[PDB]
């Protein structure tokens, strides 16, 4: 598709009306209409009005009388706001009525009326010789042949040319015109040549490659800057046109070479003409910034003036030394020849040269316009690096980047009110177990739990996490934008938690509109409010699970036993206004009214009872463990005695403490208390504090004691740290292949030229990196990129430093972002619970692996996209056996990583386990490679097969992850599981198919029958803290509730030989 | 006074750039005829909106 | 949990803009917006108006010419 | 006195947040001012201010008339 197909035409001639049409050309009878007769726009930002007449009127000189019309006075009358369409239409209409162009209507169909000379003569009020010639003989304006229209008047006047002023396009500006267009009497090509050659000896003149009305016309500039801005706009036009032509589309090019040909100009114009005629690749790639076009054009010229390509440089130089010559590619020239063959006497510019376009392979990425780029850096590339120098990142203002401490949660309102259960497992509590658990509980309470865990608990507050969601409900209710919801709905409870004023539905599912002028104050919530609310919802769901309404039943009561102001009692009182007779009271030692101020145990005289109790008692004072123990025992006892459904808090949920609770409940006469541990989503994500749930039932409870409960493990496994908590640093100096970085994030700015290099260097650490420039003019490019431990574990396996730097240099300068808006990164980004559990399991397995001695290799079967790479040490060889893994032989060879790329056979004969090897089977055992779930008996079968297969080799360690059965019992009873599910009895993590679960006892019994050594470990609190500290991940609430029961029920079998 | 503040914040004078864009001083200074032969122009007469 | 964990930083320095950002620091093209560019509140009880510029502008000395602007005449 | 008061309040809130063990972006570790030359009353503010007295965490002081309360605290 080489040859251009374009239909050339003199568009400016086609615009000139037939003489018969001039009388009604203003359409005197009817109002001018927008979008047809005019275009008005008010740019409120620049506060500039802009009118633009359409049709023949787009070229209209205005007489000073026309300027005196009120229409042109309008923008002054409305300095700040748009001219109303009424006034604009009426003024433009009456002014339009005022205009009248001298003309003689005729019968011959061949005539056209010379609109230019007509309106021009009118504007000068018929004073100039053309104006006189016209007012005396209007019939002179009619023309058959377009050129003779002017020859008639040059002959009539005897003048060699007419200097005709240009109209401004907007009719509101009255600015003095940058140039004017002279029109020469040059009937033949020879006259055109002589005039051009004379013009090439006179200041500030230029011209088009061809002329409308087939009559020569030159532009004459008042100043050099005007010549520059004109040349710029024309170059842009010819580049857009040539771009459209090269795509091969048919196009109505009014003239084949749109750009101007300087005849006499300053140097800078000659540079514009030169790069302009190059049709440089940079325009198609949008490498230039068009907002400041001529500047960019001047800049482009300079590079072409000293271009690395000899061809382009000699070509540009040549064009610069012969500026008067028009340069064109051959594909243009054929269009010129076609245009000549159609109309033999057409005039076009005599002095021309046909250069061959020089190909250039540099395919720049680019995109002007808003949007930061979110890079995904490759581990490796074609480029080799040798000892790249450290790259400092600049200081950045808060106007560009800010770093908030924690990412606020995004979540549906219902998800906040969920909770998880953990039922008792042990059938008995033997005394030796009591002494052991007491020793662990006392040793643990005596020295406070991990300082890092307490840091995350004290930074990831639930109040701040839920504030952006809660206030959003306030702002919507405040506008009246909120509407339908059920009476008992959780969205209703959130609405109660947003605003201090009582709300009331006008009828079913319709909240009352606010009284006029009223803007109720948002409800005041302390950190524990929403948690108390979710405990209320929890007690409601526990009383019966099917319910959707959460209103209290009529004639019932609830007590929020720990209290200060306790906003929750007020919100709840407000929630139940439509329900008759519902006692609701806080009852703390620090209680303010409405709540009664009272100590627990209750004074013997005082009578207290309720259908529900929600204790949140917690001693602020430091105290002995025996005192805290007796206090919590008296608290749970008094809470259980006083209600049919207690929901006690436990600040120190050791196994010994909870078992002491169940034993003490056992000691009370005549009531068998069913019980369960619990954790709501509105708790602070990291708090180990756990809500025990007591309730009488007629039967004695089988398996009443706890052991290895998840909620308890969350607390007990945390212990005083051997290291200070890892504070997230903000790095600036990017060393080339260093591996000295503490977890945190790179953040800063570089020159746009250095930017491809800097991205290529930080791919060593960061797995991805957002970048952007603030504006087209500012040359600094901001970059943010958090450090991925997994990418460090990948890139530092060998000393080679490959990167896609060649690809990154396609970005400079427009290809890597723009964003005027301030951006706000968080030190702790959100991540889904499955991903977090995966990282915790990786921390557990990695710390476990570093202890192991003398093993040649790690083999992660089912490794996907090297997901387990964080686990393996930089030394020992890594292997993957996921069929779905993509191959990268350069990356594999460079990074010491074999990839089997075939399904792994679990059958013992097929098995080929090496000596001195660590076999990871993380989460792969539960699925077939095609993604369909494998039945649990088949899972147990393949585990048994891996066991017997590794039974023979002397040194090996398998890690078979799987899902324990008990979790399905718990999620059947829980609520807060936006991710995890229980479809038809199978776990359904993420988007994965539901998959049947193993029971831990049968698996352990099988491994004991095999005779192999094993140890069913699961990751604990310190592992969680390591994953969060390293990856820069805050937990989030729903994940905070679900994570313990989820983590406990993904056991990791650790076969060892 | 308001429009004047807004105007003179842009600059009391300007100079044409080699690219032909205007570049206003940003400074409020009284003009002298010594500037007539200089690169500088009075900013009142720029006719830039 | 004894030892303090705090990230020290010269916040007042971080507020100072890059020189390239000063030209558009007033955001000349667009209207200042509440809650981002300013905070206005009218305390009907004390009947006192209170404007408060955000960003770099939170530290702005005013010239006596700036005080002559109608904006500052508004509370009256 | 009023400056010393506001700064003492700031350092007490900050130290309270630090003692809870939360990570915090303290722009400077000791927020309160150090008189170099002042009247007696300022020296009292500096003194109880540096005590980080339990009374602030307990909200025993009335913050509406801060310096007064601070002077009072100093006396005890
Ligand atoms: N006063 C006046 N000027 C005209 C009229 N028609 C065309 N021109 C001017 O003639 C100049 C060159 O005409 P053309 O070659 O047809 O168009 P152009 O050079 O691409 O310029 P524009 O089409 O206006 O962007 C333009 O700058 C127009 O402003 C007219 O009827 N009256
Ligand atoms: N982009 C260009 N195109 C053609 N000729 C150029 C270009 N740049 C410079 N020259 C020639 O080389 C000389 C270089 O001058 P110099 O670079 O010192 O200042 P200049 O002319 O303003 O160019 P620049 O804008 O690159 O500084 C000029 O006299 C000019 O004739
Ligand atoms: N809170 C205080 N802190 C330090 N020094 C004090 C304090 N109160 C009193 N003093 C010292 O003891 C003296 C007691 O003075 P006196 O109590 O009569 O009046 P005062 O200085 O205004 O104190 P007050 O406000 O308690 O009346 C003072 O000179 C002062 O130096
Ligand atoms: C951690 S606070 C939470 C209270 C409630 N969730 C709130 O803030 O609205 C627990 C409160 O229980 C109170 N408390 C402690 N021991 C108590 C006891 N033995 N009897 C009654 N209240 C007690 C304390 O004063 C403390 O303020
Ligand atoms: C459930 S996915 C994710 C596993 C785990 N999260 C990880 O990244 O290590 C397990 C992967 O193992 C692969 N796989 C499934 N069955 C396999 C088998 N029998 N042998 C080897 N790989 C298998 C699949 O391609 C799948 O992508
Ligand atoms: Mg045109
Ligand atoms: Mg400060």
TrEMBL record, chain A:
UniProt keyword annotation of Nucleotide-binding present: yes
Binding sites annotated in the UniProt record for S-adenosyl-L-methionine 1: 526, 528, 562, 590, 599-600, 620, 631
Positions of S-adenosyl-L-homocysteine 1 binding: 528, 563, 566, 589, 600, 619
Keyword terms, alphabetized: ATP-binding, Nucleotide-binding, S-adenosyl-L-methionine
Chain ranges of the Reovirus VP3 protein Methyltransferase domain: 473-694, 855-1055
UniProt-annotated binding residues for S-adenosyl-L-methionine 3: 838, 842, 864, 882, 904
Cysteines paired by S-S bonds: 615-639
Leader sequence segment: none
Residues of the Reovirus VP3 protein guanylyltransferase domain: 9-279
Residues that coordinate or bind S-adenosyl-L-methionine 2: 562, 564, 599-600, 631
Domain Reovirus VP3 protein bridge: 727-821
Chain positions recorded as ATP binding sites: 271, 302, 305
Residue numbers binding S-adenosyl-L-homocysteine 2: 904, 992
Name this polypeptide is given: Structural protein VP3
């Amino acid at each position: 598709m080489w040859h251009y197909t374009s239909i050339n035409n003199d568009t400016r001639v086609a615009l000139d009306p037939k003489p018969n049409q001039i009388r009604t050309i203003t359409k005197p009878n009817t109002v001018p209409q927008l979008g047809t007769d005019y275009l008005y726009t008010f740019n409120s930002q620049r506060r500039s009005h802009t009118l633009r007449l359409l049709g023949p009127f787009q070229y209209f000189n205005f007489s000073e009388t026309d300027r005196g019309h009120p229409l042109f006075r309008l923008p002054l009358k409305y300095p700040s706001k748009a001219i109303p369409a009424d006034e604009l239409i009426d003024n433009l209409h009456s002014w339009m009525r005022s205009v009248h162009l001298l003309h003689v209507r005729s019968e011959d169909n061949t005539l056209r009326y010379n609109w230019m000379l007509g309106v021009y003569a009118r504007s000068t009020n018929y004073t100039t010789p053309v104006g006189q010639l016209v007012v005396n003989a209007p019939a002179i304006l009619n023309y058959s042949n377009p050129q003779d229209a002017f020859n008639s008047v040059f002959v009539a006047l005897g003048i060699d040319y007419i200097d005709i002023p240009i109209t401004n396009s907007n009719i509101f500006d009255d600015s003095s015109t940058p140039y004017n267009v002279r029109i020469w009497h040059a009937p033949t090509m020879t006259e055109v040549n002589h005039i051009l050659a004379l013009m090439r000896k006179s200041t500030l003149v230029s011209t088009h490659s061809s002329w409308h009305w087939n009559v020569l016309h030159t532009f004459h500039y008042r100043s050099e800057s005007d010549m520059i801005d004109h040349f710029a706009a024309k170059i842009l036009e010819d580049w857009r046109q040539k771009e459209k032509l090269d795509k091969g589309a048919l196009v109505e090019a009014d003239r084949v070479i749109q750009r101007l040909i300087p005849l006499s100009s300053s140097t800078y114009v000659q540079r514009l003409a030169a790069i302009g005629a190059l049709y440089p690749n940079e325009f198609t790639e949008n490498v230039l910034d068009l907002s400041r076009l001529s500047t960019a054009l001047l800049q482009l010229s300079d590079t072409y003036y000293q271009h690395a390509n000899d061809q382009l440089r000699r070509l540009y130089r040549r064009m610069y030394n012969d500026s008067r010559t028009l340069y064109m590619t051959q594909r243009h020239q054929e269009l010129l020849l076609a245009q000549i063959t159609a109309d033999p006497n057409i005039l076009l510019y005599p002095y021309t040269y046909i250069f061959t376009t020089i190909p250039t392979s540099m395919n720049y990425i680019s995109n002007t316009g808003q949007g930061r780029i979110k890079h995904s850096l490759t581990v490796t590339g074609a480029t080799e690096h040798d000892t790249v120098a450290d790259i400092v990142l600049g200081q950045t203002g808060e106007d560009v980047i800010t770093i908030s401490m924690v990412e606020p949660m995004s979540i549906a309102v219902e998800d906040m009110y969920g909770y998880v259960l953990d039922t008792p497992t042990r059938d008995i509590w033997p005394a030796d177990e009591q002494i052991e658990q007491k020793g662990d509980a006392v040793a643990l309470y005596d020295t406070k739990t991990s300082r890092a865990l307490g840091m995350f608990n004290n930074t990831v507050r639930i109040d701040d996490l839920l504030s952006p969601l809660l206030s959003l409900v306030y702002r919507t209710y405040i506008k009246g934008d909120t509407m339908t919801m059920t009476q008992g709905s959780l969205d209703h409870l959130t609405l109660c938690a947003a605003v201090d004023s009582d709300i009331t539905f006008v009828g079913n599912r319709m909240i009352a509109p606010l009284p006029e002028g009223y803007i109720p104050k948002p409800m005041h919530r302390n950190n524990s409010t929403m948690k108390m609310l979710s405990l209320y919802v929890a007690l409601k769901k526990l009383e019966n699970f099917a319910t959707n309404s959460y209103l209290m039943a009529p004639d019932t009561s609830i007590i929020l036993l720990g209290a200060e102001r306790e906003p929750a009692v007020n919100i709840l009182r407000r929630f139940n206004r439509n329900v008759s007779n519902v006692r609701i009271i806080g009852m703390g030692d620090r209680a303010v009214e409405p709540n009664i101020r009272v100590r627990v145990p209750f004074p013997i005289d005082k009578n207290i009872s309720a259908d529900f109790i929600i204790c949140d008692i917690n001693s602020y004072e430091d105290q002995s463990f025996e005192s805290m123990f007796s206090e919590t025992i008296s608290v749970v006892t008094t809470c259980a005695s006083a209600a049919t459904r207690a929901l006690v808090k436990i600040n120190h949920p050791s196994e010994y403490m909870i078992n002491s609770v169940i034993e003490r409940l056992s000691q009370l006469g005549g009531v068998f208390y069913h019980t369960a541990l619990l954790k709501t989503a509105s708790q602070n994500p990291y708090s180990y504090e756990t809500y025990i749930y007591i309730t009488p039932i007629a039967a004695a409870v089988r398996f009443p004691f706890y052991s290895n409960s998840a909620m308890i493990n969350r607390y007990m496994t945390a212990v005083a740290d051997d290291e200070m908590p890892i504070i997230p640093s903000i790095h600036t100096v990017i060393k080339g292949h260093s591996n000295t970085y503490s977890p945190g994030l790179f953040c800063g700015c570089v020159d746009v030229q250095s930017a491809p290099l800097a991205l290529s260097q930080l791919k060593s650490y960061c797995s991805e990196a957002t970048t952007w420039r603030v504006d087209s003019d500012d040359n600094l490019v901001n970059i943010i990129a958090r450090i991925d431990p997994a990418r460090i574990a990948l890139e530092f396996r060998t000393r080679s430093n490959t990167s896609a730097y060649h690809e990154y240099q396609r970005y400079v300068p427009n290809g890597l972002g723009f964003k005027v808006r301030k951006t706000r990164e968080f030190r702790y980004m959100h991540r889904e619970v499955t991903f977090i559990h995966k990282l915790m399991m990786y921390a557990l397995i990695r710390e476990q692996i570093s202890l192991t001695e003398n093993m040649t290799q790690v083999v992660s079967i089912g490794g996907r996209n090297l997901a387990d790479i964080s686990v393996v040490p930089l030394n020992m060889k890594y292997v993957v056996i996921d069929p779905a893994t993509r191959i990268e032989t350069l990356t594999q060879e460079k990074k010491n990583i074999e990839v089997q790329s075939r399904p792994f056979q679990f059958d013992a004969a097929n098995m080929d386990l090496e000596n001195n090897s660590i076999y990871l089977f993380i989460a792969v055992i539960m699925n077939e490679p095609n993604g369909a779930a494998t039945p649990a008996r088949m899972q147990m079968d393949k585990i048994r097969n891996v066991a017997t297969a590794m039974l023979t080799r002397t040194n090996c360690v398998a890690y078979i992850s799987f899902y324990e059965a008990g979790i399905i019992t718990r999620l059947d009873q829980s609520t807060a599981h936006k991710t995890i599910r229980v479809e038809e009895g199978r776990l359904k993590v993420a988007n994965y198919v539901p998959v049947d679960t193993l029971v831990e006892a049968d698996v352990t019994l099988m491994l004991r029958d095999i005779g192999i050594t094993h140890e069913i470990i699961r990751p604990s609190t310190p592992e969680l803290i390591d994953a969060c500290s390293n990856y820069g991940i805050r937990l989030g609430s729903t994940g905070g509730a679900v994570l313990d029961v989820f983590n406990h029920y993904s056991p990791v079998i650790k076969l060892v030989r | 006074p308001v429009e004047y503040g807004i105007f003179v914040q842009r600059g009391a004078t300007y100079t044409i750039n080699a690219a032909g864009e205007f570049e206003f001083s940003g400074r409020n200074e009284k003009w002298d005829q010594a500037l007539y032969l200089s690169e500088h122009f009075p900013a009142l007469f720029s006719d830039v909106p």
